[PDB]
Amino acid sequence: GRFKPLAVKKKYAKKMNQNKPVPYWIRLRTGNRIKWNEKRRHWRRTKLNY
Amino acid sequence: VSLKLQARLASSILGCGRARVWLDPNEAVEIQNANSRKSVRKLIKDGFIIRKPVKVHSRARWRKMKEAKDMGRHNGVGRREGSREARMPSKELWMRRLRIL
Amino acid sequence: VAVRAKVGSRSYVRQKQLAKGKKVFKIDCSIPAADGEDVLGNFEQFFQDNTKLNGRKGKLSDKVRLSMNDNVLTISTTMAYRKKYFKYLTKKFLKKKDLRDWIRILATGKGTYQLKYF
RNA sequence: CGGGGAAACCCAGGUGGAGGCCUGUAGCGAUGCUGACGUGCAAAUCGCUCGUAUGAUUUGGGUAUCGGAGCGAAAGACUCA
RNA sequence: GCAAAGAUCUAACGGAGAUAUACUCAACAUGCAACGUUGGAUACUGGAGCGGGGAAGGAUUUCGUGCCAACGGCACUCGUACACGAGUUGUUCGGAAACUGAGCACAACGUUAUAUCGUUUUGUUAGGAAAGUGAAGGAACUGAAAAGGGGCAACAGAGAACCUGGGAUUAUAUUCCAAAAAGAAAUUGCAUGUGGG
RNA sequence: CCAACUGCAGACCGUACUCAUCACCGCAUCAGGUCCCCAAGCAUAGAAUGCUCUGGUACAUAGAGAAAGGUACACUCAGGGAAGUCGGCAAAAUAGAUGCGUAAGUUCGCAAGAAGCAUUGGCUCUGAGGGCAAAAAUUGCCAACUCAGAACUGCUUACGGCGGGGAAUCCAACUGUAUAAUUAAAACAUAGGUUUGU
RNA sequence: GUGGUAAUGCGGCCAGGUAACAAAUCAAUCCUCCCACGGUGAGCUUUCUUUUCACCAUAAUCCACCUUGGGCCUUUUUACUCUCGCGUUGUUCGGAGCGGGGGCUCAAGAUUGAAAAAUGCAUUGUGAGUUCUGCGUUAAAGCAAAAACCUGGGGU
RNA sequence: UACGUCCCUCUCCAAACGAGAGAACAUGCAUGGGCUGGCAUGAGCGGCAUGCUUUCGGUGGGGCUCGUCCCGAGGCGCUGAACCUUGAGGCCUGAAAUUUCAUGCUCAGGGACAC
Ligand SMILES: [K+]
Ligand SMILES: [K+]
Ligand SMILES: [K+]
Ligand SMILES: [Mg+2]
Ligand SMILES: [Mg+2]
Ligand SMILES: [Mg+2]
Ligand SMILES: [Mg+2]
Ligand SMILES: [Mg+2]
Ligand SMILES: [Mg+2]
Ligand SMILES: [Mg+2]
Ligand SMILES: [Mg+2]
Ligand SMILES: [Mg+2]
Ligand SMILES: [Mg+2]
Ligand SMILES: [Mg+2]
Ligand SMILES: [Mg+2]
Ligand SMILES: [Mg+2]
Ligand SMILES: [Mg+2]
Ligand SMILES: [Mg+2]
Ligand SMILES: [Mg+2]
Ligand SMILES: [Mg+2]
Ligand SMILES: [Mg+2]
Ligand SMILES: [Mg+2]
Ligand SMILES: [Mg+2]
Ligand SMILES: [Mg+2]
Ligand SMILES: [Mg+2]
Ligand SMILES: [Mg+2]
Ligand SMILES: [Mg+2]
Ligand SMILES: [Mg+2]
Ligand SMILES: [Mg+2]
Ligand SMILES: [Mg+2]
Ligand SMILES: [Mg+2]
Ligand SMILES: [Mg+2]
Ligand SMILES: [Mg+2]
Ligand SMILES: [Mg+2]
Ligand SMILES: [Mg+2]
Ligand SMILES: [Mg+2]
Ligand SMILES: [Mg+2]
Ligand SMILES: [Mg+2]
Ligand SMILES: [Mg+2]
Ligand code: NA
Ligand code: NA
Ligand code: NA
Ligand code: NA
Ligand code: NA
Asked: In 3D, which of B76, B77, B64, B80 has the Cα closest to residue C5?
């Protein structure tokens, strides 16, 4: 709904900002072990419940 | 070729449901070129998009039946389903008559 | 309403009449005749026959007068007629002649009509 | 308000809308089919049928009382399957 | 087995999704089945709505473009999927500043080996000295009277000055619009003049 | 002095979208559950039920297609009519409105819609029931539907929706409550009565 | 400060008031629906159809000031003399002042105009719903409070 | 190699699907017509008239206008009419008939086995 405390809104904003895939140049690096973000979140799979 | 965006914008602009918005089956490139509300307004001005009239719900049958009822038809014993007080409350008749007197 | 209606009374209907009569309705056929007609006489005959007065087709008396002056058509009556009625009669005419798909009719002003094209 | 009556009072017709009153929606329940389903739509649901529906009624939010305990119109019911 | 909630049909367009062929073979009998959009047809919801808005809950699912590996228990050219790029505008709307309620419990005091316990609105804390400033009077320094400390708890109670038009969006709007504010108001807090009796 | 102007300034946070047969909870886009506002036309007593303009939708895997045997918010059935069965379970049946009529029993309130009998269509008419104005017991204009009564004319008894009824026995006075997920009852509650402590 | 016989009109502290409150009935504001009439557009038109469908709108905030209902003033008050009168659909009311005449006041609406056509879309009358509002029975049930604000009583 | 068989196709005495009975340019199929049957008198129009029937016969309780012409359930006439009649699949193109069937579609069947 409309209401949320600004702090909850900021936590949700940070979670949105984190829900991004890995840049590919990260995969080109010398000792790289990461290929997928593995902490990706879909709003329908798992809840944050803020 | 999907004209969903243009149909949505036209429904918003014309103030009507989707069923009354008419998108010319010919002239589909010209409609697809319209990505803004301004260009959809221009399509509406050129006749490419038209608000269609509402469907007819006619009261003519009911008016004819109302004339018949006013002459006194269709209101006999076999016709009435509610109680007499439901059809004509006794309190309303009493209030009318006492106010008259 | 005040008096109960009868079916026999529906047999003959009487049309209300105004105070200062000679009310005029004009159709303007300038545009269709400007194009390529002997159809103004057709329209006048149609209005002389198929116009209803007191519920009867024809027999207008002095009350309803139809004249065709200068490529248009004037209708002058002392009865409470609606303009939409003569528009309805015109649309029936154009539905007979097959012109209705081509000739349209609009209120060019207060009391008059005009035949336009598409 | 009409009629009787010595009186006390009696006999009518209207008005008015009372009730943990009745029929019946929504709502709140859940009688029967011992129906459906019974590796289900569902770890209790579905259909028809059924109880009640101005009240000791139903419901949102807030608030108070718990594990040797709380709460209970009392079924050892319920206290996040 | 994928059977409740009645249902789709037709053409054109789009699409790799076709009218897809060894010989013979005119076409049937050798490329089936399925798509999204628009138009038309047919039907359903039937205002206690597969309508239009809110709380709780969710938190980008919204919007545009693109793309169909996986996911949408059939399918997809489609998607609440995936990728990229955007989007939420307030003196007056809701809250808070700023009310009280059922209640809560900081302080105080008491208790407890232990405060992580109790009391704390039946006008009201605490053996309990809990008030810190209107004034004056010669610019901020001094001080009367006033009994019962400080908070919190309602986004449906109390309270609260704005509302129409817009050709104004891809998506927000009683929030945006620019001097002809499309405009019309109301209301705070300070200051400036006119006038007062 | 301060009551009408006028001048400047009006800070913070929320605001997308959803609110559900796909956006919440139920491991899931689950026939379950989830508070509030606006709520149209005709039939009709109507927020019953059926159909419809506006808005919304054609989304639920589909195509072909008379095996048996199923399930059904699907029917019918000669003659008999509960002989079936533990038991009329299921189904059938009754039905609206109006007039008439209505027993035992009774706490006088009821029992009662007791039971029963009859009528309702369609058309064409007639009567009654009003408001405004200038023996006004009259003169004009006018609106909303109802109820009653006739003549004529039909029925294949024909949408939906809508009690079956009676005579008794046991128990509990009654309305309520109650084993979420096998028990709704005669159990609990209840008013009323009695006792106890103070 | 001031006018009206009056109802009432106008330019520290103390005590009241608003906030502030269950139900029904009957009238109802907007608004919704319907009907009548009249415009504008559309649809049907083999045949009929003076037809069928759609539309005809006016926000806040201000100025002026034609009804309904409540409270009240003043005046007549042999008003209730032996059937008192007034009034509701309804359970009433009156010398503790009914009714009539003339006024004061409050609450709902009207009407006039400013806004406002410069906007909007392609019209002016009736009947049914509708609780804003008006009218200030169950009870061994009698149906919150405070801030803030308002007015007076005293005093400057 | 050849006869041939099956699938595609068509019919229905068969039939859940296989299988069966059949046909293979065949009145085979399609559409008409007639028959046989079902229902019960269509739409439209009209009231002594250019209508119906073969000289006959031709409404309506009421109601409304100015004797006429209008509204009016229902009735009468044209009219045992209109419609339906083979389809999960009636008859007739081969007895006779006041009539007893007419038309048109097919234009080298295709495929696989036999091999
Ligand atoms: K969870
Ligand atoms: K079948
Ligand atoms: K059947
Ligand atoms: Mg949250
Ligand atoms: Mg009564
Ligand atoms: Mg009851
Ligand atoms: Mg069972
Ligand atoms: Mg036990
Ligand atoms: Mg299977
Ligand atoms: Mg429908
Ligand atoms: Mg809804
Ligand atoms: Mg799939
Ligand atoms: Mg995503
Ligand atoms: Mg408190
Ligand atoms: Mg608070
Ligand atoms: Mg606010
Ligand atoms: Mg929004
Ligand atoms: Mg909702
Ligand atoms: Mg209904
Ligand atoms: Mg309903
Ligand atoms: Mg679905
Ligand atoms: Mg399914
Ligand atoms: Mg039988
Ligand atoms: Mg029988
Ligand atoms: Mg037996
Ligand atoms: Mg036996
Ligand atoms: Mg039974
Ligand atoms: Mg008796
Ligand atoms: Mg009995
Ligand atoms: Mg009876
Ligand atoms: Mg009992
Ligand atoms: Mg008991
Ligand atoms: Mg007993
Ligand atoms: Mg009860
Ligand atoms: Mg009970
Ligand atoms: Mg149980
Ligand atoms: Mg008991
Ligand atoms: Mg077959
Ligand atoms: Mg022969
Ligand atoms: Na919400
Ligand atoms: Na009944
Ligand atoms: Na299936
Ligand atoms: Na983003
Ligand atoms: Na669901």
From this structure: B64
